Structure formats: structure tokens, C-alpha cells
Amino acid sequence: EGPLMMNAFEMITLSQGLNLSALFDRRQDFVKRQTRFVSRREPSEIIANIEAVANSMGFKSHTRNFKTRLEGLSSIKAGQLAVVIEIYEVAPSLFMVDVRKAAGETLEYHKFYKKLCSKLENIIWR
């Protein structure tokens, strides 16, 4: 058992250029940071590492199938971030980790993603 397969045509559908949801936004004060990286480590190990870092950062984590849901345990609303993370195999030893905001403030989300990645700089591939 492993992450879902994502072929090149599937990967390109990730582009902010191809998804027109953004034209329908009412409030958008901020610019989207790119919240994705690639890795070569075994998928179950990627997951365990993401779960460990998130736990130490004050997040409750629930994983089903190389898809993780993170919820902030902060008692302060701005810290009540929800995040989903999924891993896809884009090539036989290459996995993309796609991080998405399910709920919460954009600026807090960006701060989160920066901190996450600095804790995981080992698993991140060139």
C-alpha cells in the first residue's frame, strides 16, 4: 500500500493558473505562498515525521491513507488553523507533499508552513 499515483497530466491541474475558483473570492487581502515540496524518503516515514513536527507545534493530527488532517490546539482563535496534507507519487522514488489550508487565517497558515518546513529540512529534496 502506498500514496496515490499522480501522472504528469494530473500534476498540472494543481496550477493556480488552471483553477478559476479565485475569480469568485469575495475577500482576498493576501498573496498565496507556494505550500508544496518534494521528497525521496519512504512515504510512511514522511508521514511519521510530519506527525511528529506537527505534534510538537501544538496540532492534533489524524491520518488515514497518506492523507493527514492537522487541527490547531491553541486556545486563541487566530491559532485555530486547520490543514490537510496529502502525499502523491509523481515518479517511482519521488513524492510530492501538498499542504493545504482547510480553515483559519492565511498569515497564520504561512507562518505555520514556514515553521513546518524548517523542522523537516532533512526530508525535503533539492
Partner: protein, 182 residues
């Protein structure tokens, strides 16, 4: 005109008129002229009027049916009709095909897939070797190129999408039904 537009699209009169409110927003952000130009479009999608992107250029170009460098309200509504939950799926399939045929060759060329894959990586700020990108391009292309001839044609694309319908996931905006309330 809202009645004419509603009759050539899956939209109703009340929906076209709701879309006009949106168009007024999008088309007035830089030059208030009742048209959307490239920079206004980049601003709506990226919140950065100066951010260039291959896929946005391709979307813009396909929206611009009059080939006049801008998106008028008519062009805007006719093309969005394709993203309606109720548009026929084959229209969705052929719109995506048109996007990916970067240089209007009538096919999705192998180097057109490659250029898209490189742009996606660039957009995401991901750094991969030429060899790695080749493996990724080759796997997808050999699978879509049914007839093994070196290009991807509309019927091959149609079959490819029938085997993985999520390939046209971007081709539905599933709330073009709830635009009145917006």
C-alpha cells in the same frame, strides 16, 4: 442580451445578471473600460498584476474567442458556461485539450506536455533534474498516445480522460449554481 446569453449557455437570466456584477469588478481593476486585459486577469487570479504564468496565459487566450487581446462580458459568459456543473462533459474535455495544445498545433505535442510540466514545477518553486522531468513526461505521454504515433489527438485525449475523469476536475466550478447568493 442577458436573455440571449442565458439561452446559448447553461445559465439563466438571473445568473447572467449576477455574473455581470462580477465582471464589473474584474474588468475595472486597472483600466475601467468594461474589458479584462492580461494584467487585470493576473490580478484576479494571483493578486499580483505582474505575475506571468503559462496556464493563466492559456486560459486567457481560450477565453478570448475574438482574438482581440481582451475578455469582453460576452466572451466571459460563453466560456464560463463550459465550467457549469451541467455543461456536457465533452465540451469540458475539448476545452482542456485546447488549453494544453500550447501553440495551436491541433495536437498535444510531447514538448507541449514537457513545457507545461516545467512551468508547474517553476510555479511551485520546485527544482528537479532534466532526467527526472523526462521520466514524468514519458510515462504520461506514452499512456495518452494510444496509437503510438508521437502526438496526442482529441480522440486519444477523450479516451484518456474517460479512464481518469479527475483529469478535467478544474473544468467544473461546482458553485456556478450558487452565484445569485454570492
Amino acid at each position: 442580451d442577458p436573455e440571449l446569453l442565458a439561452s446559448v449557455t447553461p445559465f439563466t437570466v438571473e445568473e447572467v445578471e449576477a455574473l455581470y456584477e462580477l465582471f464589473k469588478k474584474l474588468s475595472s481593476s486597472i483600466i475601467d473600460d468594461g474589458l479584462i486585459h492580461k494584467e487585470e486577469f493576473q490580478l484576479a487570479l494571483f493578486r499580483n498584476r505582474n505575475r506571468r504564468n503559462l496556464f493563466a496565459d492559456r486560459i486567457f487566450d481560450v477565453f478570448d474567442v475574438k482574438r482581440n487581446g481582451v475578455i469582453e462580458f460576452g466572451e466571459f459568459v460563453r466560456s464560463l458556461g463550459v465550467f457549469h456543473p451541467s455543461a456536457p462533459v465533452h465540451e469540458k474535455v475539448k476545452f482542456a485539450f485546447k488549453l494544453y495544445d500550447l501553440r495551436q498545433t491541433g495536437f498535444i505535442e510531447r514538448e507541449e506536455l514537457k513545457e507545461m510540466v516545467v512551468a508547474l514545477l517553476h510555479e511551485s518553486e520546485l527544482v528537479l533534474s532534466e532526467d527526472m522531468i523526462e521520466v514524468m513526461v514519458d510515462k504520461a505521454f506514452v499512456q495518452a498516445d494510444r496509437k503510438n504515433d508521437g502526438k496526442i489527438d482529441i480522440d486519444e485525449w477523450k479516451d484518456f480522460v474517460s479512464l481518469n475523469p479527475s483529469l478535467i476536475k478544474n473544468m467544473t466550478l461546482p458553485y456556478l449554481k450558487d452565484i445569485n447568493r454570492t
